Design an enzyme around this catalytic site. Structure first.
Site, mmCIF file in Angstrom:
data_model
loop_
_atom_site.group_PDB
_atom_site.id
_atom_site.type_symbol
_atom_site.label_atom_id
_atom_site.label_comp_id
_atom_site.label_asym_id
_atom_site.label_seq_id
_atom_site.Cartn_x
_atom_site.Cartn_y
_atom_site.Cartn_z
ATOM 1 N N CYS A 63 4.151 -100.883 52.343
ATOM 2 C CA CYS A 63 2.823 -101.530 52.184
ATOM 3 C C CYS A 63 2.956 -103.072 52.175
ATOM 4 O O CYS A 63 1.924 -103.766 52.157
ATOM 5 C CB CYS A 63 2.090 -100.921 50.997
ATOM 6 S SG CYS A 63 1.881 -99.133 51.049
ATOM 7 N N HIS A 106 -2.860 -107.414 45.998
ATOM 8 C CA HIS A 106 -2.590 -106.133 46.711
ATOM 9 C C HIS A 106 -3.676 -105.185 46.208
ATOM 10 O O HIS A 106 -4.421 -104.651 47.049
ATOM 11 C CB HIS A 106 -1.141 -105.683 46.484
ATOM 12 C CG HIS A 106 -0.611 -104.667 47.434
ATOM 13 N ND1 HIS A 106 -0.662 -104.814 48.803
ATOM 14 C CD2 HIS A 106 -0.018 -103.490 47.209
ATOM 15 C CE1 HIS A 106 -0.110 -103.753 49.372
ATOM 16 N NE2 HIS A 106 0.288 -102.939 48.421
ATOM 17 N N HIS A 160 -7.031 -99.368 51.287
ATOM 18 C CA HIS A 160 -5.688 -100.002 51.344
ATOM 19 C C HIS A 160 -5.046 -99.616 52.679
ATOM 20 O O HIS A 160 -4.758 -98.423 52.860
ATOM 21 C CB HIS A 160 -4.797 -99.609 50.172
ATOM 22 C CG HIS A 160 -3.386 -99.986 50.461
ATOM 23 N ND1 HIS A 160 -2.956 -101.293 50.424
ATOM 24 C CD2 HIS A 160 -2.332 -99.261 50.839
ATOM 25 C CE1 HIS A 160 -1.674 -101.337 50.746
ATOM 26 N NE2 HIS A 160 -1.277 -100.116 51.001
HETATM 27 P P1 PN7 Z 1 5.029 -91.650 38.837
HETATM 28 O O1 PN7 Z 1 4.453 -91.881 37.479
HETATM 29 O O2 PN7 Z 1 5.951 -92.671 39.417
HETATM 30 O O3 PN7 Z 1 3.872 -91.510 39.915
HETATM 31 C C1 PN7 Z 1 4.239 -91.677 41.275
HETATM 32 C C2 PN7 Z 1 3.281 -92.588 42.005
HETATM 33 C C3 PN7 Z 1 3.191 -92.169 43.453
HETATM 34 C C4 PN7 Z 1 1.906 -92.501 41.372
HETATM 35 C C5 PN7 Z 1 3.871 -94.007 41.987
HETATM 36 O O4 PN7 Z 1 4.415 -94.306 40.704
HETATM 37 C C6 PN7 Z 1 2.842 -95.040 42.359
HETATM 38 O O5 PN7 Z 1 1.920 -95.371 41.640
HETATM 39 N N1 PN7 Z 1 3.016 -95.589 43.546
HETATM 40 C C7 PN7 Z 1 2.152 -96.579 44.136
HETATM 41 C C8 PN7 Z 1 2.491 -97.935 43.554
HETATM 42 C C9 PN7 Z 1 1.646 -98.802 44.429
HETATM 43 O O6 PN7 Z 1 0.547 -99.114 44.066
HETATM 44 N N2 PN7 Z 1 2.124 -99.131 45.619
HETATM 45 C C10 PN7 Z 1 1.427 -99.932 46.602
HETATM 46 C C11 PN7 Z 1 1.239 -99.006 47.795
HETATM 47 S S1 PN7 Z 1 0.264 -97.526 47.418
HETATM 48 C C1 DKA Z 2 3.423 -98.620 50.358
HETATM 49 O O1 DKA Z 2 4.344 -99.377 50.193
HETATM 50 C C2 DKA Z 2 3.474 -97.156 50.013
HETATM 51 C C3 DKA Z 2 3.156 -96.304 51.201
HETATM 52 C C4 DKA Z 2 4.063 -96.566 52.370
HETATM 53 C C5 DKA Z 2 3.292 -97.030 53.595
HETATM 54 C C6 DKA Z 2 3.768 -96.386 54.885
HETATM 55 C C7 DKA Z 2 2.793 -95.369 55.448
HETATM 56 C C8 DKA Z 2 3.430 -94.028 55.767
HETATM 57 C C9 DKA Z 2 2.528 -92.826 55.602
HETATM 58 C C10 DKA Z 2 3.263 -91.508 55.572
#
Ligand code: PN7
Ligand code: DKA
Ligand code: PN7
Ligand code: DKA
Lengths: 412, 80, 412, 80
Positions: free
Chosen positions: A167, A304, A341
């Site tokens: 991301c 973000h 997003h």
């Molecule tokens: P866990 O408590 O780690 O839950 C897993 C998830 C997938 C919820 C992870 O911690 C999370 O929140 N990831 C996204 C973090 C974020 O905001 N990334 C930016 C791209 S979506």
């Molecule tokens: C962002 O850093 C978390 C998601 C990763 C983005 C790449 C998209 C791939 C979708 C399977």
């Protein structure tokens, strides 16, 4: 060292086909999230997305070549065409002039690129054997084919680079282009982040980790960065593009000057594969390096702000830690409420939004602010745009793997 | 089956014009894909594959290799 | 600018699990291409590949975590662990010391990353619905998760960057790391290119464009760069890794010094999405700028040399043109005969190979040279390793999208 | 069915131990996944999926959030 300016911009997302329509809709607080129609999501736990419904690939490329490009590349060609035309670089045949071509490269960003094309050909192969694999598969799907197709379309022959940092790919693509120009590897760079992954395995991949909002009954209210009732992000598709140019070369050309690059920062959390560092510590460090390189007063932060629980919380903590206190944090908004997003494309789109906000003295709002989150207590420009002139803007991006990128642009 | 052969020719000419973004008119028996239709090596392989699907057939690799003009594919499908 | 040295190296490929065994077998002209066993290829037009048959993931990570990382990341963890230990930088707990962690980053490279994982989950979602997509799918497949897992494994918190420029990714990963140190964004960078795409949709994708060799009867003679009977590349899997360090920092801590970074070049053809530019025009410019940038006499060139008709031809043409004549080209070889072409990993593997060739005065040979190609008229070190001391080595990498990267390292 | 109950519980224990790479010794009915078994959010959702496959069961998401110790999962399997 060498000064770098922005001389052209373009973007496409679920609220517009070009940057003027899109930014206007974003600044008015519209929302492009809708029910998924690009595949059958009737049986899925997440059925909403920032789908672009008025996009016609035939208007950007020859129909014969359309079947040669994944949707993300099609969107990149739309955004870059707009930015290149916007820049005045192009000759009468919509090419880079042959004597500038070797010193103009392309820096592209995407998280996964043509996911739907890998998914479709994976299934062809499984159901009917490798004879059913389409020959245009690989070159329609590889992230770097953004730069491949665009360099060919515009005749630009400088460094041809591609970032795939999840991301934060859109923002790292900016930084790698800046670095290339700073080290005299190019005088001009086309930057473009692009992503389009609204497909069964993409939606399914994010729903199985419970990262997506399931507010399926009200799509326009599901994406709500920093709000207490947020419950996951909404996936958007789109592309943003920028032309970066060394200053002297821009002036000599007569280029229009949108902004001058001011600073960047890059870091890794080295913590968890999907969750951010405690206290957003890696984000803190990236924002700190950018701020100390730029040495300007930032008047607007495009966060973000994906509308997950973890990202909005720890970004707010890191923001508060880097500016010193809550009152010392500039106005911040995330435009992910408006357009979803957009993952790999997000940093590129949000740099265009940030620069436009500065050009126009209009700071776009964080929409769907209905229930203050006591842990999220910054000035998020709630619900309505803020008419305020700013001298510099900062845009943050973070990705899976704990990779962080930040860029600051200042007034021209 | 002269009428059947004619219908087959029509179908093949349609498929070629669709894959190479060309007017059926340009699809002459003596039509080289690269010089007369603007096709390259990638367009050629995917075209041959569409034929196999459109016509539920399988062109072996040797005959596909010698294909130079529209009439080559035309004959192959005639002798199918 | 700041001076940069290689202080640690690692690699794993179809001829060895570490750089010592692997290079020895490569200099001996051994060949790791085998009949495909990682999947049922019996119905496939291509049934050979450079498979690693002795790699055990549970030796680089705990069993619970193996499920979380694609094979390319497992190979990368293997290669980087070797390089990080070799460098002597790890503390008593096999982590980067905290006081250095913020200034050590990672630059990773791959072309597609976890293709097999995207393919599997695409089929799961196409047979049983989205509830069957494994939660570990996304972070097992994203290319930047090489930097993700490695940064968590060694606690390195500097810039976390990822290149995805197809077959040239491993070389661009080196260059982005060099750019970052040169601009003082880091003092050290772990570099790693890793690829593992031996799976049904991977082989079918390249077969369907007739890129792969179909000499299934003799996997040891299939890959023959520059030979007149070459008929397509053979896909290889593996990973190579370097630790780069600013020169004074390496001296202060007493680091082993394999080589010094000398020069780099990057360009795009802006010609065709798979075919090389006529006369290797793009490759010529990247090589010339690396040579103009290194200002040293190159004694050995590790060519891209994937064993396709067009690539080996146009690379040879570019080599003569840049050095002046076929007589002025230094000795050249491609090691893709030995280990296959490893796509995004090749640039990283081939830099380790080239530096080791320089370290040990042993230039590895281009194997399977049986019929001279009159158009490919260079000295390709045919079939047998050559004993020659060189003071500088150059490594070439090109990718789909017409993207080119070149690096030169010089003796310390 | 005491024997049936024992069998089902042993299956659950084996599955959890394999997923988290923990010995069946540490998987007490009162064992907590994050505190006592070294698992995080991602590990939990993957473990729940394996159990649903290992027992053809289909836990709703609402109830799955309400899990802290292995006991909750085993009870839910009992209610089956
Ligand atoms: P866990 O408590 O780690 O839950 C897993 C998830 C997938 C919820 C992870 O911690 C999370 O929140 N990831 C996204 C973090 C974020 O905001 N990334 C930016 C791209 S979506
Ligand atoms: C962002 O850093 C978390 C998601 C990763 C983005 C790449 C998209 C791939 C979708 C399977
Ligand atoms: P067409 O005549 O362009 O055929 C396409 C092929 C697949 C032969 C393609 O042009 C090709 O092989 N190109 C260059 C070879 C090369 O550089 N390979 C390394 C990356 S695959
Ligand atoms: C090299 O430039 C060829 C393209 C490599 C793409 C990465 C491999 C994935 C395709 C199966």
């Amino acid at each position: 060292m060498r000064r770098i300016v922005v001389t052209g911009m373009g973007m496409i997302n679920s609220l517009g086909l070009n940057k003027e329509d899109s930014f206007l809709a974003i600044a008015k607080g519209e929302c492009g999230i809708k029910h998924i129609e690009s595949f059958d999501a009737s049986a899925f736990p997440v059925r909403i997305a920032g789908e672009i419904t008025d996009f016609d690939p035939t208007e950007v490329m020859n129909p014969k070549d359309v079947k040669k490009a994944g949707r993300f590349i099609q969107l990149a060609l739309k955004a870059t065409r707009e930015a290149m035309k916007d820049s005045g670089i192009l000759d009468a045949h919509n090419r880079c002039p042959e004597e500038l071509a070797n010193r103009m490269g392309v820096s592209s960003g995407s998280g996964i690129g043509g996911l739907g094309n890998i998914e479709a050909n994976s299934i062809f192969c499984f159901e009917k054997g490798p004879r059913k694999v389409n020959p245009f598969f690989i070159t329609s799907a590889l992230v770097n084919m953004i730069g491949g197709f665009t360099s060919i379309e515009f005749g630009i022959k400088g460094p041809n680079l591609s970032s795939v940092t999840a991301c934060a790919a859109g923002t790292h693509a900016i930084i790698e282009a800046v670095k290339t120009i700073l080290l005299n590897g190019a005088d001009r760079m086309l930057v473009v982040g692009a992503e389009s992954t609204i497909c069964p395995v993409g939606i399914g991949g994010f729903a199985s980790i419970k990262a997506l909002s399931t507010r399926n009954d009200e799509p326009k209210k599901a994406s709500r960065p920093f709000d207490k009732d947020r419950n996951g992000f909404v996936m958007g598709e789109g592309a943003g593009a920028l032309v970066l140019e060394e200053y002297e070369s821009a002036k000599k050309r007569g280029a229009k000057i949108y902004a001058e690059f001011a600073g960047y920062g890059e870091s890794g959390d080295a913590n968890h594969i999907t969750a951010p560092a405690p206290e957003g510590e890696g984000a803190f460090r990236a924002m700190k390096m950018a701020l100390e390189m730029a040495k300007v007063e930032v008047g607007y932060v495009n966060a973000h702000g994906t509308s997950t629980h973890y990202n909005d919380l720890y970004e707010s903590i890191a923001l508060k830690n880097v500016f010193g206190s809550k009152e010392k944090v500039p106005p911040v908004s995330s435009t992910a409420g408006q357009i979803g997003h957009c993952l790999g494309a997000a940093g590129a789109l949000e740099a265009v939004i940030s620069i436009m906000a500065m050009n126009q003295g209009i700071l776009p709002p964080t929409i769907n602010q209905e229930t203050p989150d006591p842990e999220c207590d910054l000035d998020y420009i709630p619900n309505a745009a803020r008419e305020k002139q700013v001298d510099a803007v900062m845009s943050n991006s973070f990705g899976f793997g704990g990779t962080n990128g930040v860029v600051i642009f200042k007034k021209a | 089956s002269m009428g059947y052969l004619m219908a087959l020719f029509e179908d093949i000419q349609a498929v070629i014009a669709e894959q190479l973004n060309v007017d059926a008119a340009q699809v002459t028996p003596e039509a080289e894909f690269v010089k007369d239709l603007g096709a390259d090596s990638l367009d050629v392989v995917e075209l041959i594959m569409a034929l196999e699907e459109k016509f539920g057939i399988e062109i072996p690799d040797e005959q596909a290799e010698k294909i130079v003009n529209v009439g080559d594919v035309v004959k192959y499908i005639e002798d199918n």
